[PDB]
Amino acid sequence: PKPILYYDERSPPVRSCLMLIKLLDIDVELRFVNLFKGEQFQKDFLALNPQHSVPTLVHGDLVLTDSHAILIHLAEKFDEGGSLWPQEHAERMKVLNLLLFECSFLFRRDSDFMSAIVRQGFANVDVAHHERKLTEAYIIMERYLENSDFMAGPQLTLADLSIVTTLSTVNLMFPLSQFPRLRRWFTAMQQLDAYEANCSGLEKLRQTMESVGSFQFPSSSAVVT
Amino acid sequence: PKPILYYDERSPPVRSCLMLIKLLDIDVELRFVNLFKGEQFQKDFLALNPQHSVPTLVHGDLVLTDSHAILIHLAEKFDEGGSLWPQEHAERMKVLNLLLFECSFLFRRDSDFMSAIVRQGFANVDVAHHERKLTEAYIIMERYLENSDFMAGPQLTLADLSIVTTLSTVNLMFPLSQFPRLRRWFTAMQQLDAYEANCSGLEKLRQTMESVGSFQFPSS
């Protein structure tokens, strides 16, 4: 049967999956789970995914609870033999390594910062601490892009779809003026038709965070086309 | 060329890679990076891996900087047709999903806790907060084991190697008596010859964390 995606588009990993669904023209059913209202702790959703997280994909009997497994599964089923999840082993391992960087380093640090805002209120967050941790991720991505125009090589892959949504989220707060390769890449990603799937959720997240955290992001930071 | 593994066996993701190397008889070259001395910030290692993390694998031209990529790469290269990284897609996705749970949930929350000990001193850590966050992970793993003897099904997979090393590290602090499936599974993993590759670095981590956090784990 048709895949079912439990989602809140404020989440950057959710947006990565929405971008791949648009890019590959996949017919999915969308089921909203409001993360800021705690709907992910509702009994039936917890029974399905005890990690209480989105995105969650139900595809037949398969239940996936991590965006990077959802991206790989959808590429294997709906882009078989394609270049997003490369056929050659070394290229595939490079993409996998960059998906794991997104999980373990870029997303972890952005989640630490945004969670602190929700918990503590922006005015009580140690913003300079988080700026250092997230600038460090910008420096690493700039060094990846000094070698190729995409994150994992000369072609668009799943790694770019995973990284661009969290990068756009970090860039609500922290500017990219000192990172010319990351600016060129982000601009290129924003010209993809599939990047439209990032836009609503990024704006919803901006508004929600400003409301819960009682602050404004600096409008000058976000790179816009 | 033979794979090169940059490692500190106190790291649980390192230990998962040491367990797979033993389980598949892989010939690697080990290169020690002392995490508690900050050697992962040395200029040459940072140039190789700017995430300043171990394990890092160099295999020919391929540089992998996450244990879960290293586990998958070594299984594909040295265990084609094995059960650890199943060939059938739905089973492979289930293992991949559990590897990502280990990264994003179990390891994240254990790293948060152990980092707080180093940064604040054990006596100053909000232990009840971390006990809730990590017991949550125990509860989830207990659910995953409902149908099966192993994390991803009836057979040992990469998911079990990834999870057991971090689970053993959490268990320095928080016991398993409430979790019958998890306790049985952990005892079963402890019987594997490959589990010997977890022993040495777990005890080194215990001794290092107890001196540095000026405390004694309850399990010690």
Nearest to A73 among B65, B93, B104 (CB): B93
Q: Residue A17 region, left (φ>0) first, then alpha (ψ -120 to 50), else beta? A: alpha
Specify the DSSP element, H or E, that contains A32: strand A29-32
Amino acid at A36: F
Q: With 0-12 CB in 10 A as exposed, 13-18 as middle and 19+ as buried, what is B36?
A: middle
Do residue B93 and residue A64 have CB atoms under 8 angstroms apart? yes
Residue with tokens 């922290």: A174
Specify the DSSP element, H or E, that contains B29: strand B29-32
Q: Is the dihedral of CA A100, A105, A110, A112 positive or negative?
A: positive
d(CA B115, CA B125): 10
Do residue A90 and residue B65 have CB atoms under 8 angstroms apart? no
d(CA B151, CA A76): 23
d(CA B55, CA B76): 18
What's the token pair of residue B20? 């797979």
Q: Give the helix ranges, DSSP H, for chain A.
A: 12-23, 43-48, 67-78, 89-101, 108-120, 127-145, 158-170, 180-190, 196-213
CA distances (Å), B67 to each of A68, A98, B55, B216, in order?
A: 15, 12, 6, 29
Residue with tokens 């439209």: A196
* CA-wise closest residue to A3 among A63, A69, A47: A63
Nearest to A105 among B51, B72, B90 (CB): B51
Residue with tokens 């694998």: B57
The angle at the Cα of A159, spanning A178 to B136, to the nearest 5 degrees, equals 100
Specify the DSSP element, H or E, that contains B134: helix B127-144
Residue with tokens 């199943």: B86
Cβ count within 10 A of residue B32: 12
Amino acid at A218: P
* CA-wise closest residue to B165 among B39, B12, B8, B2: B12
Answer yes or no: are the C-beta atoms of B174 and B138 closer than 8 Å. yes
Residue with tokens 């989440």: A11
Declared resolution, Å: 1.5
Residue A28 is classified by DSSP as -
CA distance A225 to chain B (A): 30
Q: What strands, in cross-sheet order, belong to the sheet with B4-7? A: B29-32, B4-7, B56-59, B62-64
Do residue B66 and residue A108 have CB atoms under 8 angstroms apart? no
Range of the domain at A199: 1-225
Using an 8 Å CB-CB cutoff, list chain A residues near B158.
none
Using an 8 Å CB-CB cutoff, list chain A residues near B143.
50
Q: Is the dihedral of CA A39, A45, A46, A49 positive or negative?
A: negative
Answer yes or no: are the C-beta atoms of A3 and A74 closer than 8 Å. yes
What's the token pair of residue B202? 């777990």
> Which method, experimentally, gave rise to this model?
X-ray
Answer yes or no: are the C-beta atoms of B161 and B197 closer than 8 Å. no
d(CA B202, CA B23): 18
3-state helix, strand, coil in chain A (%, to 5): 60, 10, 30
Amino acid at B31: R
Say how many CA atoms lie within 13 Å of B89 toward its Cβ: 13
- What is the domain count for chain A? 1
Q: Give the helix ranges, DSSP H, for A121-214.
A: 127-145, 158-170, 180-190, 196-213
Answer yes or no: are the C-beta atoms of A30 and A3 closer than 8 Å. no
Do residue A72 and residue B101 have CB atoms under 8 angstroms apart? no
What's the token pair of residue A159? 């790694």
Using an 8 Å CB-CB cutoff, list chain A residues near B93.
62, 64, 69, 72-73
d(CA A23, CA A194): 5
Using an 8 Å CB-CB cutoff, list chain A residues near B62.
90, 93-94
d(CA A167, CA A151): 12
d(CA B208, CA B122): 13
What's the token pair of residue B110? 């254990």
